[PDB]
Design a binder for these strands. Structure first.
Lengths: 146, 37, 174, 98, 58, 213
RNA sequence: ACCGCUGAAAGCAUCUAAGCGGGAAACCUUCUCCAAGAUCAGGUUUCUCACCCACUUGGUGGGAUAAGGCCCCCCGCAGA
RNA sequence: CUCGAUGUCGGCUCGUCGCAUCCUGGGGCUGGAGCAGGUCCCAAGGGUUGGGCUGUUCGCCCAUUAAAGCGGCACGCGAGC
């Protein structure tokens, strides 16, 4: 049997990802793995280990220029018509953190633990995050081996 | 422009240029100025 | 044989690579430029300019031709003037250079004060002839076509704000 | 602690730890020796296979309990087919003394 | 896989090493010594590294 | 700035204008009873102003509200509404403890007047949506005044959202725009407004200067 | 859509590859209205703040109330 | 698929969506003098009437009109007529 998931057994560290120049897919996958807590071996799909992830400088996160003007973010309102098409271009010059957060939430599983997990991801446009109360340690991305 | 989706040159002055997705032609005399699709 | 022109410069003022961007001052104002990274632009040891980049991959070539004629734009636009002569054709225009700026009128009410942007100059020679100038050839041409595209091409008589003509079309009449 | 290998499965036990292992041929009292795959002293782990064929875990078979009543009731559909059969997997309890 | 990538090796190469080295542990007990003993697991990872051939040719 | 003021409406009249026409006019007492409590665009990112208006006894209001009137330094007021100002604070246009009056609207300055309607009740789909409801004689069994249908059969096997249906209408804040003020009685309070102001007679009404000129 | 400037590759010509500009009742804005159950459940401000019992001191329940609100009652051009 | 029931046409009421646009918006060409006109491109936001004959959709007509779309949704809509 396992010994990893129990009561008060999981550890809560923090992470700051500087979305400086990185591309959106790698960034979101990395934040999602940190957020679920697969970077951790003491893992289980029932419990919520994983670290509060902060994504800073999400204003300048790289997307293909040919995608800032083509890839659209539709969001339907139930009312007939009411399909609210919107590219990530205007969506970026309005809420880049919403773009990033959308990608991350999309890479998480689809369940209630997904909600309890995504409540752990903060994302900010400028370099300046307010959650410095902790010791948010910078996690930068690194392809591994093989 | 006359838009037919099979574009050829008309005279001995049409230039089968390509311009941002649509393949248009230009003979510098807008008699046809046709364009593809 | 595109690569047989490295830029010279008469006045030789500010022509040196301040970090992959060029600028030139002198008899005219100054200008900048943001050229693509896979371009190499260097100086010449008598004071001239040179340009290349030893990659041969079919973007080297597009950037070759452009980058070269665009740095030419810069320097031979500051030293050598940039100006286009546009002749009114038809009836009814006589200029008022109000402030430094032009007010048009041909064939309708409300003479139109064409905005005086930053970094151009309006010139006139007659009621039926004027011209524009500046430092940036693209600026010059864009405003020169803003002035054209006024009373769109009509072949039946010709009311053309032209570029010293350049062969406007003609009628089929009645 | 050693990863004893028994019953086609493998178990991780140090000394003195009970294990619900397969129906070993045995009684109570008489001990029994079981091979390992990996035995560890914290920082001295044993890995080389010939160094492990020497290390033998040993423990006293005892209890010979049964597993729990695994109720099978196969039932497909309109087919109209039921097959109900159960199962008590025979087991044994084990202590570890090596 | 998580403990492996903690040791900079991927699960694939970890298994290929624990195979070529031959330590007949199985994913269950391998995960147990992963949880409780980061030390024993890192010994296992060095075992696997020492039992990888050279490259992506063979 | 968008010069606005509160006030209640006293009812309609008609007044004859300069050119010997009629002005079917609404009287709105915007009287000199509107005091302020600024809202900085820095503490809370509005740049709005807190206009008060009303006459109540201390006994009539609860402790939080009277505390806000004291911290602003004003004696309480039955209403306490707010008006956005700008992308700017400008620190001199208003003041906490200021006083307003209907006098800003300068006899011709178009206002746009906003306020809650008169509740037309739980009004069915013909007092509510203007349905040319089904016939009245030619056999129509029971469906005079009744909606009719709500969508189609099997693909929208569902009634679309926002389907015009019966429900409680009325009371919703409405803004009637561009109401040219015909006169301004700063000598007994009122402000004449050539038009039809929304709401019950004797009810809150915010008279904002227009946006359309 | 179309128009255009600068401009190559492809010593030219091109609205295009880099660049920039025009451009419509259509898109986001602007306006009118809902709206923090926006669970990401916001904000500015104001008000009240020992408050007594028993336990397993405590937490934990209880009880008492503060400010507040409700229920009763008189009503409404507010309303099933 | 539905026969141990999926109520058929037209009208009404209420819609709603598509663009293959009738009008309104921007355009290119025109064998486009001006008025216009004819054809092609983009464009769905609104708008797209009233009657006579017909159970009639289909039409024909009268008077307009900016124009008097062409379709989908069980040839939308009968626990709504």
């Amino acid at each position: 049997p396992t010994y990893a998931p129990k009561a008060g057994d999981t550890t809560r560290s923090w992470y700051v990802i500087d979305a400086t120049d990185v591309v959106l897919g790698r960034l979101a996958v990395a934040a999602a793995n940190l957020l679920r807590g697969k970077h951790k071996p003491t893992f289980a799909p029932n419990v919520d280990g994983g670290d509060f992830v902060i994504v800073i400088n999400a204003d300048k996160v790289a997307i293909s220029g040919d995608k800032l003007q083509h890839k659209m973010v539709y969001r339907h309102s139930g009312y007939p018509g009411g399909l609210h098409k919107r590219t990530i271009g205007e969506l970026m010059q309005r809420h880049p953190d919403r773009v990033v957060e959308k990608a991350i939430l999309g890479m998480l599983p689809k369940n209630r633990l997904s909600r309890q997990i995504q409540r752990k991801l903060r994302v900010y446009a400028g370099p300046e995050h307010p959650h410095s109360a902790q010791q948010p340690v910078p996690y930068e991305l690194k392809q591994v081996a093989q | 422009v006359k838009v037919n989706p099979s574009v050829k040159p008309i005279c001995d002055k049409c230039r089968l240029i390509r311009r941002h997705g649509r393949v248009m032609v230009i003979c510098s005399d807008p008699r046809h100025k046709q364009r593809q699709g | 044989r595109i690569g047989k022109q490295p830029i010279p410069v008469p006045a030789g003022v500010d022509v040196t690579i301040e970090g992959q961007s060029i600028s030139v001052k002198g008899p005219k104002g100054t200008l900048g430029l943001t050229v693509a990274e896979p371009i190499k632009v260097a100086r010449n040891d008598d004071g001239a300019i040179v340009v290349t980049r030893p990659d041969d991959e079919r973007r080297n070539r597009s950037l070759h031709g452009l980058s070269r004629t665009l740095v030419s734009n810069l320097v031979t636009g500051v030293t050598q003037g940039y100006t286009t002569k546009m002749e009114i054709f038809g009836v009814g225009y006589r200029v008022q250079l109000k402030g430094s700026n032009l007010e048009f009128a041909l064939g309708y009410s409300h003479p139109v004060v064409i905005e005086a942007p930053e970094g151009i100059t309006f010139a006139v020679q007659a009621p039926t002839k004027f011209t524009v100038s500046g430092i940036d050839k693209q600026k010059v041409g864009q405003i020169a076509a803003n002035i054209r595209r006024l009373r769109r091409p009509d072949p039946y008589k010709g009311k053309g704000v032209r570029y010293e003509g350049e062969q406007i079309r003609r009628k089929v009449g009645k | 602690y050693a990863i004893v290998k028994t019953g086609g499965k493998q178990y991780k036990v140090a000394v003195g730890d009970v294990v619900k292992v397969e129906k070993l041929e045995s009684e109570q009292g008489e001990k029994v020796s079981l091979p390992v795959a990996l035995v560890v002293d914290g920082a001295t782990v044993t890995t080389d296979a010939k160094a492990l064929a020497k290390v033998a875990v040993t423990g006293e078979v005892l209890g010979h309990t049964k597993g729990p009543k695994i109720r099978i009731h196969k039932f497909k559909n309109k087919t109209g087919y039921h097959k109900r059969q159960g199962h008590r997997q025979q087991l044994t309890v084990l202590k570890v003394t090596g | 896989n998580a403990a492996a990538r903690l040791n900079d090796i991927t699960y694939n190469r970890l298994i290929q090493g624990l195979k070529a080295a031959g330590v007949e542990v199985d994913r269950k007990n391998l995960a147990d010594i992963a949880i409780s003993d980061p030390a024993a697991f890192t010994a296992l990872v060095d075992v696997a590294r020492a039992a990888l051939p050279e490259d992506v040719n063979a | 700035a968008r010069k606005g003021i509160l006030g209640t409406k006293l009812g309609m009249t008609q007044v004859f204008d300069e050119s010997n026409r009629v002005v079917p006019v609404t009287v709105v007492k915007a009287g000199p009873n509107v005091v302020t409590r600024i809202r900085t665009p820095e503490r809370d990112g509005y740049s709005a102003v807190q206009l008060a208006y009303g006459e109540i006894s201390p006994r009539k209001v609860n402790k939080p509200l009277t505390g806000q009137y004291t911290a602003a330094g004003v004696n309480p007021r039955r209403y306490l509404a707010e008006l956005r100002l700008d992308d700017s604070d400008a620190a001199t246009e208003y003041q906490v403890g200021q006083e307003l009056t209907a006098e800003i609207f300068a006899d011709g300055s178009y206002v746009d007047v906003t306020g809650t309607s008169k509740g037309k009740g739980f009004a069915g789909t013909m007092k509510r949506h203007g349905f040319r409801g089904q016939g009245a004689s030619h056999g129509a069994q029971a469906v005079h005044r009744r909606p009719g249908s709500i969508g189609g059969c099997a693909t929208p096997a569902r009634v679309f959202k926002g389907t015009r249906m019966a429900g409680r209408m009325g009371n919703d804040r409405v803004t009637v725009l561009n109401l040219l003020v015909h006169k301004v009685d700063a000598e007994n309070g009122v402000l004449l407004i050539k038009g039809a102001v929304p709401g019950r007679t004797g009810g809150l009404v915010m008279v904002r200067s227009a946006i359309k000129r």
